[PDB]
């Protein structure tokens, strides 16, 4: 199982947000900690992506692009998984030092978004998603959002995405075709469900960046740049998710 071996081997470890849990909750402290967590996880997503089979055959500008567009979805999906495995989706396990209960979901001013993320987490339970299905699905999320005008070398991206879909299908293949078919259907629907969540978070973080000075929310270096240059391309429709099913 060469492909699964690799994904297992390269999977990032635990990342802490640096949140002070000894202090009372506030919108500013929670969001500043989430922002710092995003920066920390981005460092890990880059190291991971570089190690994915075939990633480096992409044009370097395209490597940059897929990372810059896909991080929100990737990170939401991984957080959904952590939440499922660590706390049976009861709370949102952003990091060991940043676990959102309902009060934090309210104080963060992201309650509705948190609801959807917890629903995603529950799906891993409801669908009985395996660790190996999770790994293949997460890898595929890196290749699920691109410019409508295409990438620099679209053909190499298309080939890579194709191969990650095939690896997912293999990990699903059940000597009964109907079982594998229903399963692939379910998992592709679940992958699609990440995108509207990521989009709502894109809008929220962009709006927050625009007003960050007014609410005492800190955005680290890479996050601020990505959210001001790359995220607006998503929000303006220049960059769109790749859906399996018609929305």
């Amino acid at each position: 199982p060469i492909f699964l071996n690799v994904l297992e081997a390269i999977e990032p470890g635990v990342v802490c947000a640096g949140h002070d849990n000894n202090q009372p909750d506030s919108f500013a402290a929670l969001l500043s900690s989430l922002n710092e967590l995003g920066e920390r996880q981005l460092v890990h997503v880059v190291k991971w992506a570089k190690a994915l089979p075939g990633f480096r055959n992409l044009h370097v500008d395209d490597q940059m692009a897929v990372i810059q567009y896909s991080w929100m979805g990737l990170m939401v999906f991984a957080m959904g998984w952590r939440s499922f495995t660590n706390v049976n989706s009861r709370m949102l396990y952003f990091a060991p030092d940043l676990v959102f209960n309902e009060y934090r979901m309210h104080k963060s001013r992201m309650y509705s978004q948190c609801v959807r993320m917890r629903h995603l987490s529950q799906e891993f339970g409801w669908l009985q998603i395996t660790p190996q299905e999770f790994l293949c699905m997460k890898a595929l999320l890196l290749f699920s959002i691109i410019p409508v005008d295409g990438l620099k070398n679209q053909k190499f991206f298309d080939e890579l995405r194709m191969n990650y879909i095939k690896e997912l299908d293999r990990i699903i293949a059940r000597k009964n075709p109907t079982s594998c078919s229903r399963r692939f259907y379910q998992l592709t629907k679940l992958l699609d469900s990440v995108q509207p969540i990521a989009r709502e978070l894109h809008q929220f973080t962009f709006d927050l960046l625009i007003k960050s000075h007014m609410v005492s929310v800190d955005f680290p270096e890479m996050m601020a740049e990505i959210i001001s240059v790359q995220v607006p391309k998503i929000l303006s429709g220049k960059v769109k998710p790749i859906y399996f099913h018609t929305q």
Partner: peptide, 13 residues
């Protein structure tokens, strides 16, 4: 051109 991100992509470390 995100310099910090490109640096992370370019560095081996």
């Amino acid at each position: 051109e995100n310099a910090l991100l490109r640096y992370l992509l370019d560095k081996d470390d």
